[PDB]
Amino acid sequence: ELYAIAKELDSWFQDVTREKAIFEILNKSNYDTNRKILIAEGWIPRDELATLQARLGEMIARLGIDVPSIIQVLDTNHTPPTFHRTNKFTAGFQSICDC
């Protein structure tokens, strides 16, 4: 039985770990009991915003019921972080730079 089962006990481990992770993703989110649409916000770049504000549908193309998404435009006080790139070839250089 061990021989047979371990083969995919490992797969269940991966799966439960992933499902866990998505919980925690939800668990630093909001919830209210009586109102039924949540209050939410995103911290993805304006640089790549177009592709994802499009893929709203692609995601909802996999679950489309009524809402491609809800995203209302407003920016409040905050300091956006900084992002940088290495192209997997200058890894040592920029890695040392940042560290």
Binding site: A61, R62, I65
Partner: protein, 452 residues
């Protein structure tokens, strides 16, 4: 007019409306071209001319009879639905109720000029009239007799590849179902449609409509067809005796409905599943316990029970639903002072894996039952075990012997009276590895705790 307003959120009704309604075509030249008495066409034309908001409404009454025995399907459908809405629009003839009322002869005559032609014709001719048999206060009990013993519309509903048809037919069926004294009469015709009601849900069962790998499973709002179906199935929730019998015929699909609670992401759908299955329960009618017994027998929902329990959905109605559900399904679960039923099984000569067969929550101390006759009550089962090799009974017979000896360590003498260890090892040398596993469990636990 507080009468029926139907499917406003929908569009297939709107397409089958606008296909002939949006046509702002001549509705006067018809009779003049050898179709009818001419004033009838003049007023069919005046329909739209007077359609302008005029804040009359008493110069179109007689036209109902005129289109009765028509012989060219060109000049009723359109103005038919136009006047139907004009009524529906609660701005024209809001007191047309009385004229509708004093004698529905002008209405019940409509049968032969309604629900006729092709399926689309049947709809365009039937929806309008049925919207008007919603006359607040009582409603005609007699027209329905002819509207149901008929068969052409039902033939229209028999198709499976078309969803709009059955959707709208049974949707208006449930809207009119607001008169609780009609589910009764249609009951006798159950076998004609209720299986149709069930086929959609049976498809929904393993068909993961939510997973959009199903290309065009239904229109973007089409899935609401299931919502409406279960709406109807709830509309029959005030007569238990009705639910009492038809179950014996199709209990299986009703049972495996269980999945819908967890499967559908939609709150509405799981909600209606659970509510319907529960409300089947009632102190009102008889044998209102064996149903859950078979539920446990085949489905074993309690896992599912608590599973859905841990994940409530902030719906008070649902809170009470599930709370009832759990308590009502669990309190009987301990209905096992099983000396009586163990004796019945003993005399039955049949055994099977069952919580009635297996529940230690009582066996904490029950050797008293074993004490009836020198512990030989199970010796009969042992000799039958020796007699044959039927998997279920063969395994279960020695399955609980280990437990029973676990109940008395002193029972080593009765055990050696058994002395079936050779038979036990033989069972480790027969088919169905599971029963071999069980036999090994029995023998091993026994020996170990005789010399633990």
């Amino acid at each position: 007019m507080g009468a029926t307003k139907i499917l406003m959120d929908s569009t297939h009704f709107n397409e089958i409306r606008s296909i002939i309604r949006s046509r702002s075509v001549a509705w006067d030249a018809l009779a003049r071209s050898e179709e009818l008495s001419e004033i009838d066409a003049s007023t069919a034309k005046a329909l739209e001319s007077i359609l302008v908001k005029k804040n009359n409404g008493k110069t179109l009454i007689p036209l109902i009879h005129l289109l009765s025995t028509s012989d060219n399907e060109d000049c009723k459908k359109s103005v038919q639905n136009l006047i139907a809405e004009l009524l529906s629009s609660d701005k024209y003839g809001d007191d047309t109720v009385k004229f509708f009322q004093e004698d529905p002869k002008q209405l019940e005559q409509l049968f032969d000029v309604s629900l006729k032609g092709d399926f689309q014709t049947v709809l365009i001719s039937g929806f309008n009239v049925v919207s008007l048999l919603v006359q607040n206060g009582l409603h005609n009990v007699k027209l329905v007799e002819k509207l149901l013993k008929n068969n052409n519309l039902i033939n229209i509903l028999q198709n499976i590849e078309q969803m709009d048809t059955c959707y709208v037919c049974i949707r208006l069926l449930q809207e009119l179902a607001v008169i609780p004294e009609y589910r009764d009469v249609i009951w006798l015709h159950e076998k004609k449609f209720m299986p149709t009601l069930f086929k959609i849900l049976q498809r929904a069962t393993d068909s993961q409509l939510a997973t959009r790998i199903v290309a065009t499973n239904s229109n973007h709002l089409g899935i609401q067809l299931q919502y409406h179906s279960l709406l109807l199935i709830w509309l029959l929730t005030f007569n238990p005796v009705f639910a009492n019998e038809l179950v014996q015929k199709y209990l299986s699909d009703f049972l495996d409905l269980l999945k819908l609670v967890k499967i559908t992401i939609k709150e509405k759908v799981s909600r209606l599943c659970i509510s319907i299955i529960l409300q089947c329960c009632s102190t009102r009618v008889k044998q209102h316990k064996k149903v859950i017994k078979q539920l446990l027998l085949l489905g074993n929902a309690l896992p599912t029970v608590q599973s859905l329990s841990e994940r409530k959905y902030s719906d008070e109605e649902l809170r009470q639903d599930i709370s009832n559900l759990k308590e009502i399904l669990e309190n009987e679960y301990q209905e096992l002072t099983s000396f009586d039923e163990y004796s019945s099984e003993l005399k039955s000569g049949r055994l099977e894996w069952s919580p009635v067969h297996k529940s230690e929550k009582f066996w904490r101390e029950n050797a008293v039952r074993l004490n009836e006759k020198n512990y030989e009550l199970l010796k009969i089962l042992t000799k039958l075990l020796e007699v044959s090799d039927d998997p279920q009974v063969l395994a279960v017979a020695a399955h609980d012997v280990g437990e029973y000896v676990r109940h008395y360590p002193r029972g080593k003498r009765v055990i050696e009276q058994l002395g079936g260890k050779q038979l036990v090892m033989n069972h480790m040398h027969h088919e169905d590895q599971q029963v071999r596993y069980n036999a090994l469990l029995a023998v091993q636990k026994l020996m170990v705790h005789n010399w633990e």
